[PDB]
């Protein structure tokens, strides 16, 4: 049977026009056993790049986690639309908010979509002519070391403009995550 020291590379050899892999990532073969040009055999989906948060990343990708709750149409909501709810806010009879932020309730035909956009609410000034519909992501600014009280923002923030009213608009600084295409290459040795 198996062993404690499982190193399949030391048990697999590659020759000219012949690849021998010891069956124990996973691979699948068509029913014929046929393989073709440009044919996938092995799948190496890595949990290291997996994320539990519903927000997905979209050289590097930015992932903004957002609390989304899919409730039925006949479910009583204890939160109002475009309202700011804090941590542990009771949204339903048995559902509590995990993150504090702006609550967005999208009422569909047969489903109630409740979205909680976590972030700091900031009031932009008159000169702050930020794009209303086009959200802009701000990277880590290289703050001058001269200023002592200048708290260096080491994490990238996603600024989204929320316009609940036609005359009043707010800016929400949502969080971001890092997903790098170039950084990160992990594959188990298949041939020695």
């Amino acid at each position: 049977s198996p062993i404690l020291h499982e190193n399949s590379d030391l048990l697999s050899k590659r020759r000219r026009n012949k690849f021998i892999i010891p069956l124990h990532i996973s691979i699948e073969i068509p029913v014929n056993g046929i393989f073709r040009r440009n044919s996938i055999l092995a799948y190496f989906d890595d949990p290291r790049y997996r994320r539990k948060s519903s927000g997905i990343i979209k050289d590097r990708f930015f992932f903004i986690p957002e609390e989304v709750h899919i409730l039925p149409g006949s479910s009583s909501i204890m939160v109002r639309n475009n309202s700011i709810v804090g941590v542990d806010t009771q949204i339903t009879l048995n559902l509590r908010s995990r993150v504090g932020g702006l609550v967005r309730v999208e009422r569909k035909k047969k489903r109630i979509e409740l979205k909680i956009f976590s972030g700091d609410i900031h009031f932009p000034g008159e000169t702050d002519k930020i794009s209303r519909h086009t959200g802009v992501l701000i990277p880590p600014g290289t703050g001058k070391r001269n200023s002592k009280e200048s708290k260096k923002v080491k994490n990238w923030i996603y600024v989204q403009r929320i316009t609940p009213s036609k005359k009043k608009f707010f800016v929400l600084v949502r969080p971001v995550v890092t997903y790098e295409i170039t950084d990160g290459i992990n594959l188990a040795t298949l041939f020695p």
Partner: protein, 157 residues
């Protein structure tokens, strides 16, 4: 009686049987660096290890087992073993070859001795808490050694 046309051409005096011309000039072509005996070895180093591992991994298997002498089967024949079987459908139904390693052929005692040093290394690695990794085994080194003569062959030629 004659079966070989080529043998016949020689006795008679006739020109060689023709073959289609090959486009490549072998003045320049890649060198060949692979070894025939290697096949037996990769098959053997693993084979010796697999039998040794079975005894090594299991105390019951280890008990009643002698490293110097062991028999895979009383009546096993390597020639008889060669076969092709499509019965298994676990992943797909396709041929499954069987190769018999003569117990006599396997150098089990040497492997067992090597394994001990290796498991002790593994045990120190366990104390380290870092999984033990071994880059090469002598058998792996030999593979390069038998292989090595071939590079010279191509070169000389």
């Amino acid at each position: 009686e004659d079966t070989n046309l080529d043998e016949l051409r020689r006795d008679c005096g006739r020109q060689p049987l023709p073959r289609k011309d090959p486009g490549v000039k072998v003045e320049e072509e890649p060198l060949l660096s692979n070894h025939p005996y290697v096949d037996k070895l990769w098959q053997i180093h693993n084979a010796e290890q697999m039998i040794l591992d079975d005894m090594e991994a299991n105390p019951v298997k280890y008990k009643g087992k002698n490293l110097t002498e062991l028999t895979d089967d009383e009546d096993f024949d390597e020639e008889n073993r060669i076969e092709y079987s499509k019965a298994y459908y676990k992943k797909a139904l396709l041929p499954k070859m069987i190769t018999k390693v003569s117990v006599k052929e396997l150098d089990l005692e040497a492997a067992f001795a090597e394994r001990q040093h290796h498991n002790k290394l593994r045990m120190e690695a366990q104390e380290r808490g870092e999984v033990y990794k071994i880059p090469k085994l002598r058998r792996n080194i030999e593979m390069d050694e038998y292989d090595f003569i071939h590079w010279r062959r191509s070169l000389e030629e």
